[PDB]
Design a protein around this ligand. Sequence first.
Ligand SMILES: [Mg+2]
Ligand SMILES: [Mg+2]
Ligand SMILES: [Mg+2]
Ligand SMILES: [Mg+2]
Ligand SMILES: [Mg+2]
Ligand SMILES: [Mg+2]
Ligand SMILES: [Mg+2]
Ligand SMILES: [Mg+2]
Ligand SMILES: [Mg+2]
Ligand SMILES: [Mg+2]
Ligand SMILES: [Mg+2]
Ligand SMILES: [Mg+2]
Ligand SMILES: [Mg+2]
Ligand SMILES: [Mg+2]
Ligand SMILES: [Mg+2]
Ligand SMILES: [Mg+2]
Ligand SMILES: [Mg+2]
Ligand SMILES: [Mg+2]
Ligand SMILES: [Mg+2]
Ligand SMILES: [Mg+2]
Ligand SMILES: [Mg+2]
Ligand SMILES: [Mg+2]
Ligand SMILES: [Mg+2]
Ligand SMILES: [Mg+2]
Ligand SMILES: [Mg+2]
Ligand SMILES: [Mg+2]
Ligand SMILES: [Mg+2]
Ligand SMILES: [Mg+2]
Ligand SMILES: [Mg+2]
Ligand SMILES: [Mg+2]
Ligand SMILES: [Mg+2]
Ligand SMILES: [Mg+2]
Ligand SMILES: [Mg+2]
Ligand SMILES: [Mg+2]
Ligand SMILES: [Mg+2]
Ligand SMILES: [Mg+2]
Ligand SMILES: [Mg+2]
Ligand SMILES: [Mg+2]
Ligand SMILES: [Mg+2]
Ligand SMILES: [Mg+2]
Ligand SMILES: [Mg+2]
Ligand SMILES: [Mg+2]
Ligand SMILES: [Mg+2]
Ligand SMILES: [Mg+2]
Ligand SMILES: [Mg+2]
Ligand SMILES: [Mg+2]
Ligand SMILES: [Mg+2]
Ligand SMILES: [Mg+2]
Ligand SMILES: [Mg+2]
Ligand SMILES: [Mg+2]
Ligand SMILES: [Mg+2]
Ligand SMILES: [Mg+2]
Ligand SMILES: [Mg+2]
Lengths: 46, 93, 271
Amino acid sequence: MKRTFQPSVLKRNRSHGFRARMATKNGRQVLARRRAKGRARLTVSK
Amino acid sequence: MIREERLLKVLRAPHVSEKASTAMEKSNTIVLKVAKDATKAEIKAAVQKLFEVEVEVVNTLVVKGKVKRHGQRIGRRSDWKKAYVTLKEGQNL
Amino acid sequence: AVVKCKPTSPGRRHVVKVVNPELHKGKPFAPLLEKNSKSGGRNNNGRITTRHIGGGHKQAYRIVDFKRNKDGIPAVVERLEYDPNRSANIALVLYKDGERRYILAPKGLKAGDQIQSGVDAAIKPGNTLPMRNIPVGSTVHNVEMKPGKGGQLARSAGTYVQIVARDGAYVTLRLRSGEMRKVEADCRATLGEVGNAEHMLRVLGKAGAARWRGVRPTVRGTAMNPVDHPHGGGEGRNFGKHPVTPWGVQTKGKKTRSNKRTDKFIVRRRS
RNA sequence: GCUCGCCGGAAGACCAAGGGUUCCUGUCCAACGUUAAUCGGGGCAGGGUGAGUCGACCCCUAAGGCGAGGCCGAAAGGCGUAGUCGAUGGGAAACAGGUUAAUAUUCCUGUACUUGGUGUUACUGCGAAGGGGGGACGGAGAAGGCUAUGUUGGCCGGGCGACGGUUGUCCCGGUUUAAGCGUGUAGGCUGGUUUUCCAGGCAAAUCCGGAAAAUCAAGGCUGAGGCGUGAUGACGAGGCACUACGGUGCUGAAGCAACAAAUGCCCUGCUUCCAGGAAAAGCCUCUAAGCAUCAGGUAACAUCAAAUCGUACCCCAAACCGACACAGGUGGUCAGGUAGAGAAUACCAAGGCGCUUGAGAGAACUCGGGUGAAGGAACUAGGCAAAAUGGUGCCGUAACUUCGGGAGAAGGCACGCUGAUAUGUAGGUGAGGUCCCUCGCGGAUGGAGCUGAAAUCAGUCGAAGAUACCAGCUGGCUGCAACUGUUUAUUAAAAACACAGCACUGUGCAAACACGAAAGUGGACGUAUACGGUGUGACGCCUGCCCGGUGCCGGAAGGUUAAUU
RNA sequence: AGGACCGAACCGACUAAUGUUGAAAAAUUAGCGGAUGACUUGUGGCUGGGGGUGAAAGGCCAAUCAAACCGGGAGAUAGCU
Ligand SMILES: [Mg+2]
Ligand SMILES: [Mg+2]
Ligand SMILES: [Mg+2]
Ligand SMILES: [Mg+2]
Ligand SMILES: [Mg+2]
Ligand SMILES: [Mg+2]
Ligand SMILES: [Mg+2]
Ligand SMILES: [Mg+2]
Ligand SMILES: [Mg+2]
Ligand SMILES: [Mg+2]
Ligand SMILES: [Mg+2]
Ligand SMILES: [Mg+2]
Ligand SMILES: [Mg+2]
Ligand SMILES: [Mg+2]
Ligand SMILES: [Mg+2]
Ligand SMILES: [Mg+2]
Ligand SMILES: [Mg+2]
Ligand SMILES: [Mg+2]
Ligand SMILES: [Mg+2]
Ligand SMILES: [Mg+2]
Ligand SMILES: [Mg+2]
Ligand SMILES: [Mg+2]
Ligand SMILES: [Mg+2]
Ligand SMILES: [Mg+2]
Ligand SMILES: [Mg+2]
Ligand SMILES: [Mg+2]
Ligand SMILES: [Mg+2]
Ligand SMILES: [Mg+2]
Ligand SMILES: [Mg+2]
Ligand SMILES: [Mg+2]
Ligand SMILES: [Mg+2]
Ligand SMILES: [Mg+2]
Ligand SMILES: [Mg+2]
Ligand SMILES: [Mg+2]
Ligand SMILES: [Mg+2]
Ligand SMILES: [Mg+2]
Ligand SMILES: [Mg+2]
Ligand SMILES: [Mg+2]
Ligand SMILES: [Mg+2]
Ligand SMILES: [Mg+2]
Ligand SMILES: [Mg+2]
Ligand SMILES: [Mg+2]
Ligand SMILES: [Mg+2]
Ligand SMILES: [Mg+2]
Ligand SMILES: [Mg+2]
Ligand SMILES: [Mg+2]
Ligand SMILES: [Mg+2]
Ligand SMILES: [Mg+2]
Ligand SMILES: [Mg+2]
Ligand SMILES: [Mg+2]
Ligand SMILES: [Mg+2]
Ligand SMILES: [Mg+2]
Ligand SMILES: [Mg+2]
């Protein structure tokens, strides 16, 4: 069976990468929440 | 050209291994550890100046550090750059 | 000509094709082509705004001269061509100064024919004149609605309008729908009918032939569930309601025109 | 190590994605490995990835994204112009041999090629954010010419056989060589050249487009393969020497021809059809402003540069997606022999494996198979399952029919091997020779050699010759749906949905309608032979009566009637 | 020529048996349908939750769908256990 996760680095970065989060107000609030919680890996880029 | 301070900083160490010794003894090639950001031209100039040999060509590669386990704690060694320096067939460093 | 195919397979039994032997067989004239990619009926929000559109063959847009404002310079028809973008055929014409253009092909036009536009053009098919220079009762096509804008009425295959009356600054036209309309007498028109009148005799014959033209299937409202359409629902085949569109507007007879700007130009509705 | 078995259009070899040290060497066996483990994709330590030409990066764009000003919106924001990003597409250049425990088109040997900079020389009208050309494009089909590749013969080296025979029409192995450079062939396209003129190409143009003369009738462009060189080289069966017995060192024969032949190449071709088949740059050319004995352009020579990042390993898999060392899923390329129509199938080659618990025993019962007396659907909800049919050639084939079908209807006959026709035929291929010419990769003739069906006649073996694998059960009556399609991912594949066709109805273009507080956008760069909605559902014969109810369309005299006053 | 025919790859999923704490949270084996098209497939892109998309099954929208998922209102309310 084909499963749901079909990896692709390019699509991963374009969908959830740092520059994608930084391009909208809601993405920047995601980043702010993750910084406030203290996440070591802030997005999927790293 | 490249200033002397840069040249004094680019070369890090000579690389010692069986492949390096074979390279020296068969094809007149030195194997060096160099700075990550050193280009081929900088390495060439630095070997010309500091070791006083005329070089033919430089080949470079980047070695990726190994992921290691230091007692249940995960770590990683650093990437470094390796240069294959072909001397001009009469130099004998 | 109109040709019926032989029933060698169930998909060919009912096909009727219209074939014109004199259409050009080679490639179109390259300097007058452009791309037009498809939309799938989606707008800039990405939503489907017109249903049943998608797929079909790739097409290249031909730049057709609907304005015909190159006055005084005669042109010669070089060849007739197939145009995927419209139902009429187009003609490649060559002006004496050496410029080439595409025009809608009027009925009876063939290679080697002379055409020209302007106030002094002769009254013969393919010539474009301002409608104040065209005799009353003439049959014209590619009619302008505002002077200099380009032809907008009677452009598909076989259609034409008739100039019924002229009263000062306006002419009254009879449109294919039967509507009577007034346009400024300075709007241009082209003499004759749009060619390819056999276009309506073609029979597609199979579903795939409609899919080749970018038409996607239509699902009947009665076949859905009540959440999807006002007609949906029922144990078995049930209707019991007045026919409506998917958005709830009565769909058999209810009139939808509401444009008070242009009401002054409608002499009589189409009935 | 010797046998045995399995895959071989993969269970072999590569590439992309994804993973990230799993790669190689030394060492260890606690935990991990469905058992043991001296082994491991496990632990620990060390080593390993070399590029001007491969890829990225780079130049160019598609869908789409972002978007200075702008338009719009309580705010947040939405859309969009100039622009700028975005490959899955376009754009310069390298091959063979050798080598490591582990990399190699990257290292070494040999032989090449591309772009740009700088300098010198010689000649010289150069110049774009503009114009033109080009790049540049579909489906199907048919050949013809080729090659990869294979087979056989010749040649070279070796052999003379564990058991009857084997100096021969015998056995085994080899018989390989690239890019580049020169030649411009099979073949495809296109008339060429000169002059004059012009409402066109936002201005100009010597370019393109158009018009008119003269003249010549052969010029140009593209192009697989072959041949020559590259190469007196490399490689090469094998042999001879070290072995510290893993492999190292030295030497080295022949290296040809014929035939068969792709789904690869010529071919982005040709023929044909309708559903009518990207963009932009690189590239070539034209000028504008401008520069004007400069700059710049063209050519030759010399020299310099080509940075950075990736490169190990897995990659139908134990390393990726499935929690697992999981009978699942995963895009592209390569494609040997015998039989065969074949990439099916059977047995094999190259290569790779025996699937990480075994040893016995030989009960019921379960699972997967083989055979079965007589009967032959009696079983059962139901012939479910099983059995059966199954190939090629020829003969023959009903109702009905929309004239195509039905139809492979049904049914039947032949089929192995050997000899002859014919010491190998019809056919295909084609050397030498001979004769011509605008002499060449030429033309005509010529037939050596090679290859080679199908048939007929005669004989012959078995129970059986389409002998295995592979490979339709057939016929009759009837409901439904015209048909090919689609659907409840994971209990429903259907008579349900769709469909071509039919009808009604809306819509005159700033269209109706839809998404949107709006700006806008789709409809459509379409224009009533068009577009939207609704119902019906090929085709044939048809489609009767009712406008009282509900709806819609039209009317506007009267009654009633809002804000307002 | 053909939404032509037979048939592998490929795409499906009609029947039966097995399996049902499975080898597998939908498969295996033997047959089966399409197989030049309304075909199939890679890469990238767009449509967002009363919304999308739907050859229409209330199907699908990350093993979730007659209204996804995550966080918040939130210790909702529970004459019920
Ligand atoms: Mg080098
Ligand atoms: Mg490198
Ligand atoms: Mg529609
Ligand atoms: Mg319809
Ligand atoms: Mg239903
Ligand atoms: Mg409703
Ligand atoms: Mg009923
Ligand atoms: Mg009723
Ligand atoms: Mg490790
Ligand atoms: Mg290993
Ligand atoms: Mg032990
Ligand atoms: Mg153990
Ligand atoms: Mg290990
Ligand atoms: Mg764009
Ligand atoms: Mg925008
Ligand atoms: Mg702004
Ligand atoms: Mg760009
Ligand atoms: Mg690309
Ligand atoms: Mg390797
Ligand atoms: Mg050959
Ligand atoms: Mg590798
Ligand atoms: Mg295992
Ligand atoms: Mg597996
Ligand atoms: Mg697949
Ligand atoms: Mg097979
Ligand atoms: Mg037993
Ligand atoms: Mg049994
Ligand atoms: Mg049996
Ligand atoms: Mg027996
Ligand atoms: Mg029996
Ligand atoms: Mg019996
Ligand atoms: Mg019987
Ligand atoms: Mg019975
Ligand atoms: Mg009974
Ligand atoms: Mg059965
Ligand atoms: Mg059977
Ligand atoms: Mg009945
Ligand atoms: Mg049906
Ligand atoms: Mg189901
Ligand atoms: Mg509009
Ligand atoms: Mg119906
Ligand atoms: Mg009736
Ligand atoms: Mg078919
Ligand atoms: Mg399905
Ligand atoms: Mg089912
Ligand atoms: Mg199966
Ligand atoms: Mg069929
Ligand atoms: Mg088939
Ligand atoms: Mg229902
Ligand atoms: Mg789901
Ligand atoms: Mg709700
Ligand atoms: Mg509360
Ligand atoms: Mg509670």
